[PDB]
Amino acid sequence: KQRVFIAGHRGMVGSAIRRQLEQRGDVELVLRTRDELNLLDSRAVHDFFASERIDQVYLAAAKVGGIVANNTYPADFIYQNMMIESNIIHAAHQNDVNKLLFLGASCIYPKLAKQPMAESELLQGTLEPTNEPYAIAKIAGIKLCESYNRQYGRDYRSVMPTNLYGPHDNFHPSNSHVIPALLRRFHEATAQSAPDVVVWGSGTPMREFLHVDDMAAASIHVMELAHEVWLENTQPMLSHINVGTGVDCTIRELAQTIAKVVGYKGRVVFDASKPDGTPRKLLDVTRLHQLGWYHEISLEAGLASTYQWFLENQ
Amino acid sequence: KQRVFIAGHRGMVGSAIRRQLEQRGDVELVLRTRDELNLLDSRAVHDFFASERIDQVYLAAAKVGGIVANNTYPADFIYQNMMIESNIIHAAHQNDVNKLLFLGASCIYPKLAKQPMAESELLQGTLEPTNEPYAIAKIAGIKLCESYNRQYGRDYRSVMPTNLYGPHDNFHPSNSHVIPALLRRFHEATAQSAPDVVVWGSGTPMREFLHVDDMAAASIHVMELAHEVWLENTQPMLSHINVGTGVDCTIRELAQTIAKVVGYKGRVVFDASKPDGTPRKLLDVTRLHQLGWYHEISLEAGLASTYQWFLENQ
Numbered sequence: 001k002q003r004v005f006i007a008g009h010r011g012m013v014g015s016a017i018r019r020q021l022e023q024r025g026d027v028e029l030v031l032r033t034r035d036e037l038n039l040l041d042s043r044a045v046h047d048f049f050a051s052e053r054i055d056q057v058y059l060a061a062a063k064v065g066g067i068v069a070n071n072t073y074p075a076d077f078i079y080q081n082m083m084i085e086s087n088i089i090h091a092a093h094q095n096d097v098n099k100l101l102f103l104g105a106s107c108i109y110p111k112l113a114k115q116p117m118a119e120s121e122l123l124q125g126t127l128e129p130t131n132e133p134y135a136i137a138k139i140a141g142i143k144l145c146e147s148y149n150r151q152y153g154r155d156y157r158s159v160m161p162t163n164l165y166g167p168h169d170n171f172h173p174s175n176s177h178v179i180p181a182l183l184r185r186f187h188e189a190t191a192q193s194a195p196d197v198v199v200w201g202s203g204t205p206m207r208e209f210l211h212v213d214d215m216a217a218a219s220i221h222v223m224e225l226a227h228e229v230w231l232e233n234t235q236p237m238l239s240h241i242n243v244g245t246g247v248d249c250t251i252r253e254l255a256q257t258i259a260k261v262v263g264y265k266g267r268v269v270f271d272a273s274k275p276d277g278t279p280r281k282l283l284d285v286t287r288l289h290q291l292g293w294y295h296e297i298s299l300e301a302g303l304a305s306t307y308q309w310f311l312e313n314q
Numbered sequence: 315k316q317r318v319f320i321a322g323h324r325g326m327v328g329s330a331i332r333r334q335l336e337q338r339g340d341v342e343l344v345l346r347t348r349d350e351l352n353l354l355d356s357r358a359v360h361d362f363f364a365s366e367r368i369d370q371v372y373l374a375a376a377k378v379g380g381i382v383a384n385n386t387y388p389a390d391f392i393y394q395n396m397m398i399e400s401n402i403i404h405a406a407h408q409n410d411v412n413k414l415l416f417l418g419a420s421c422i423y424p425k426l427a428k429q430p431m432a433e434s435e436l437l438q439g440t441l442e443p444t445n446e447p448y449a450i451a452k453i454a455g456i457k458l459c460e461s462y463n464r465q466y467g468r469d470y471r472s473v474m475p476t477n478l479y480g481p482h483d484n485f486h487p488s489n490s491h492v493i494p495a496l497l498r499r500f501h502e503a504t505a506q507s508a509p510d511v512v513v514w515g516s517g518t519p520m521r522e523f524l525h526v527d528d529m530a531a532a533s534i535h536v537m538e539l540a541h542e543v544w545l546e547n548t549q550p551m552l553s554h555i556n557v558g559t560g561v562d563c564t565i566r567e568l569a570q571t572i573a574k575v576v577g578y579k580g581r582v583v584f585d586a587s588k589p590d591g592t593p594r595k596l597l598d599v600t601r602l603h604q605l606g607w608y609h610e611i612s613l614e615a616g617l618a619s620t621y622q623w624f625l626e627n628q
């Protein structure tokens with residue numbers, strides 16, 4: 001069996017990968033909570049790699065937050081993510097761990113990227129200010145992987161997820177992530193028999209959403225492709241792979257679909273006196289499709305299962 | 315007196331800053347060689363800051379090299395520079411060091427930046443591949459400074475030097491840095507009475523060069539400006555300041571001037587069957603000039619003093 005360390009295993013993405021791999025008789029999972037292993041402590045990280053046996057790492061540990069967090073604690077988001085990724089990638093290499101999968105984030109493409117965004121949009125222009133610190137840290141992670149690949153012949157691969165949703169998300173009404181926020185707002189409006197739920201903006205902007213169990217499946221798929229096949233579909237200095245559906249939906253359709261999922265019978269209202277973001281933001285997932293992976297969970301089906309997980313975990 | 319830690323003090327830039335500050339009765343320098351303090355070791359760095367007294371840091375420690383090095387050891391250039399900058403900036407903040415000056419590099423602007431390159435060119439397009447790993451690490455340093463500024467009200471300022479030359483450079487004929495390489499090639503051609511010295515390319519591309527003692531003076535000037543003045547001439551998320559002459563010279567003029575400086579009497583030859591890089595690469599130094607600093611060392615005068623330092627240190 002391969003010894004697989006899922007860093008950040010209790011996280012949203014990390015836990016999704018753990019749910020799938022825990023089903024695998026060819027895999028022995030190695031897991032440490034933050035209390036058992038602080039990924040910011042280089043010495044602790046190195047000791048762990050020097051004693052445990054690892055064959056593969058899924059790097060799903062990060063300091064992640066929403067709009068308010070990223071603008072309020074910028075130093076924490078750049079420093080913590082630089083150190084976690086630096087520590088794990090370095091310790092992995094020093095201990096002859098040849099395989100690693102790093103997680104990027106789609107909010108780290110340029111603010112004014114061409115749509116849909118192919119992998120080559122990376123670094124082609126300036127970042128969204130709210131996410132800049134976190135995005136720079138994330139881009140440095142991808143470049144640490146590529147540099148260890150090129151210098152030492154490692155196999156440190158990287159995925160770039162689109163917007164994610166699903167179990168283990170933060171279902172609080174003031175989350176800046178539209179999925180979990182609207183599920184919870186709609187839930188409470190339906191409980192209260194509120195006449196309407198108002199959403200800022202016009203509802204015309206198109207966005208792309210992927211259920212975290214699809215993310216996890218794609219991540220495992222990418223990790224386990226033969227190296228030669230991964231090479232034929234990437235370049236050493238443009239190595240990441242977008243993970244998403246490649247399909248857009250309006251904020252209006254999303255909200256209306258959430259309302260239906262939850263059984264709300266009041267009115268979804270958009271307040272178009274509030275500004276809209278860019279008209280369209282989505283990944284181009286041609287490389288992932290060429291690599292033989294296609295998402296399985298439709299929006300309707302994913303929102304319904306997600307909402308059921310919330311009901312079970314209030 | 316202010317307690318000033320010059321990280322990397324034996325380096326080219328670090329030593330230039332030390333030569334100027336060692337003349338200052340208002341400054342107590344705190345210096346540690348690599349053997350006394352490995353800047354890659356977070357615990358050692360933190361212990362140093364927790365015991366020494368620091369009021370200001372000049373962050374002039376780095377893993378730096380030329381074209382071959384950056385392409386041959388990419389992981390060393392991204393990881394080492396990420397860790398050194400992360401360790402020092404974090405430890406400085408944790409120990410209430412409010413003032414820091416970080417050194418960037420002009421090779422970290424986009425390959426196809428608009429010329430002359432204003433500070434706002436940063437992150438506006440893709441990087442030169444040879445320098446990408448190092449440039450990403452350097453950009454992450456500037457963003458660590460800006461994030462600590464914004465989150466914690468620190469005063470971590472950053473300069474972006476143009477091409478540098480001067481004492482303590484690497485005067486070896488195969489250095490990819492044109493200044494030191496040509497000084498040494500011309501020196502040896504003059505010693506050998508070689509009939510000609512051939513330089514690859516046409517000699518038409520324009521570049522910008524600054525003597526390291528000017529760099530050091532500008533760095534000290536920027537560090538010591540009143541905060542309110544530094545604020546009026548920067549933005550929190552576009553905080554760095556280009557340091558250079560803002561003036562171009564052809565590779566042809568540079569080589570011809572070196573030849574004269576050294577007293578070569580053979581022929582400078584350009585081989586235009588070899589490719590030229592971009593036609594023009596230089597910084598826009600309007601912010602530094604507005605901040606009241608202008609370079610003092612002409613190319614002719616700087617090359618002559620540099621060459622004299624080489625003669626004294628063969």
Ligand SMILES: NC(=O)c1ccc[n+]([C@@H]2O[C@H](COP(=O)([O-])OP(=O)(O)OC[C@H]3O[C@@H](n4cnc5c(N)ncnc54)[C@H](OP(=O)(O)O)[C@@H]3O)[C@@H](O)[C@H]2O)c1
Pocket residue numbers: 007008009010011012013014033034037038039040060061062063064084103104105106107161162163164
């Ligand atoms: N659409 C997108 O762009 C998108 C969305 C989601 C995720 N992602 C990718 O997936 C990554 C993970 O996202 P996520 O939502 O799964 O994060 P999370 O799920 O919210 O948390 C990841 C975790 O890693 C752990 N961790 C953080 N710092 C640690 C440390 N110093 N030591 C040990 N463990 C530490 C956390 O511990 P404690 O949490 O308990 O503090 C948390 O369990 C993101 O950063 C991104 O790269 C991309």
Ligand SMILES: NC(=O)c1ccc[n+]([C@@H]2O[C@H](COP(=O)([O-])OP(=O)(O)OC[C@H]3O[C@@H](n4cnc5c(N)ncnc54)[C@H](OP(=O)(O)O)[C@@H]3O)[C@@H](O)[C@H]2O)c1
Pocket residue numbers: 321322323324325326327328347348351352353354374375376377378398417418419420421475476477478
């Ligand atoms: N035109 C440009 O873009 C340009 C040119 C030059 C410099 N610069 C700026 O100035 C920075 C310094 O350049 P430089 O030429 O002065 O470099 P250097 O001068 O060649 O070296 C800097 C030094 O820091 C030290 N150091 C490196 N790693 C260390 C570690 N782990 N612990 C302790 N000390 C460590 C080095 O030690 P050991 O060397 O003895 O290995 C070396 O003395 C550059 O990285 C750049 O940011 C910009």
